Amino acid sequence: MNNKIYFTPGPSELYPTVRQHMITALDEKIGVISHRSKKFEEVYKTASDNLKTLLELPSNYEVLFLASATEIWERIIQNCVEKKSFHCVNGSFSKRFYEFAGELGREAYKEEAAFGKGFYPADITVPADAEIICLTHNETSSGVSMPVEDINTFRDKNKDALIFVDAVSSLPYPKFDWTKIDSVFFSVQKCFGLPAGLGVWILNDRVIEKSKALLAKRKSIGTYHTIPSMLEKARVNQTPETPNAMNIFLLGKVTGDMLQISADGIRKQTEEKAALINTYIESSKVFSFGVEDAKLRSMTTIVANTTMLPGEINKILEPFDMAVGAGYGSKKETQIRIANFPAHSLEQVHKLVQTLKEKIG
């Protein structure tokens, strides 16, 4: 029995109801039913509808299921970019997405900020010939966010561009204005508290139409995971290929649970936990903020500079059945990353902070 609580930024601690929901999945033989069955269609619709409700999506948006967020990066470029994209790059994830454009033979503009820093939109312009704008709400590697108010400044910079937001390590925390962007995506092993194995692509009419326009130009936009392919199946509560039904099932159940709290309720809970952690960092003799600009510090993946090795910190936390993440990549010995996801309770965070205060200081 693994009793350790993981404050790691994805995969992470499973949403607390997942165990019982998985037992239900096994009992109901969710893993056995046909992906073409009425029962599967019901499972699909529950997850799709619950996301639309939780995220308050308008009628011009659709929800599509894929294998991973990384897959979604690829599909965005294949379906929606003929020649050029524009990317805000400030860390490892936003950088990799930018790199995909070139690997796929496209030309990408890059607006870059140093690792540990964010963006100041007043200073940013977007070339007119950029077809899409790729923003990262939460750069998980560095702990920097692009708040919704900043995201909202991009629409007028290039009115015709399709705006995509990576909220992989933050949704459902940000509350988007769906009229100012065109698409958001995530995968389920971060704030949704599921095992990895499912990506979710939320996209609007403008995105769909762009894919259809490229296909009409006799450009290949893919195969099974073209937007039209996925859309045709989504309209009958299905997927083109046999999907990860277990996760679609679990997602509908967890989102149901989330709806009982409400998205705003979860947001408040997220903020209360972040405040506990940040208050401790304000006076810690070991930890300091990994991101200088307080407005741009992530509420969901809190990155702290540390004078102590993360390995040493985790060794101290082990007897207390807790673990935090180490810094990303080359920061693995100089920062920690504390996941603050819905799966993490106030009491768990309280225990973490108290333990850190007492044993690390």
Place this chain on the structure above:
Amino acid sequence: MNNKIYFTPGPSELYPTVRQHMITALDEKIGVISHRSKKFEEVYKTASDNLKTLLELPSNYEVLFLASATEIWERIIQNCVEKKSFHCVNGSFSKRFYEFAGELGREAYKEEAAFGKGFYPADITVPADAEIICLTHNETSSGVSMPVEDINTFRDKNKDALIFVDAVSSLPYPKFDWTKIDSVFFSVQKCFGLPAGLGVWILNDRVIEKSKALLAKRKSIGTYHTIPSMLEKARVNQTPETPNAMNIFLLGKVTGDMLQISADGIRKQTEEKAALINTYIESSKVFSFGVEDAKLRSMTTIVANTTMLPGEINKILEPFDMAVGAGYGSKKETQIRIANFPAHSLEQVHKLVQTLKEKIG
């Protein structure tokens, strides 16, 4: 509690140990651990090694994990075909794979047999400029197989071509001669008895080298799921993106179970069940063979023509806690499809046949 036994050809009845293995997964927090952790590397290696052992793969082959078999169709063409492929097409799955080539801008040769029929290699030639040969060991839509002895005839028809075999609905039944082909693939929701959400691509040095050659020619071969990308990670017991750890875990456990029986043992078990079913079809007043040539009838997905509607058959079977598949597509009212996978026991098949004999005849 869903107590019905599903003889459906994928998804299908879970391997009998899956329930307890899933409980272990939950207990060990397999869904929580990092995909970059030593523990994950161990899980990965167990699944990879067990497949190499079970399938008796030689040293020039590697095992790669993807999201689905359908994804693998796409990746084969992207990574390995510059201009032209060759496909044997005799049903819905083999047809769709063939269609992907054109959707991706390639030109595909098609060797076609009617639905319900198979191939006679003596009569088949492969153009020299075909870069790959795509064979389907088990055409799940029609219940027709291409036995290994027939598969083996292709190597000399085009020595330089890469030979790919779709064994999605049959592995581990066929026993391939790995020197006469270059790659095989499957997904886990058929004979491996897992919930859907994992594809497996087994490929050799020749396949790997072709991908590297195309990339060198300055052709895009993809992004996260290029062969080199996947290979680099496979060599450290990882994947490029966050994968379906639950299924990688379950796959290693089930393959462990399978190894205790042995692949040849499972083959004998498969044959014994098929014989029970086929003996009944020989004298049934309702069922007849969906495939005329006995040599080409599938041992894993048995297709029978039926004078009774599958819906009526299943209504009769319902009180007995069993179900069979209906015919594929336009055959949904005139054929049934009986899955005979490792998950189905001799006693279960015996119960099915006895019930059919007694109630249908």
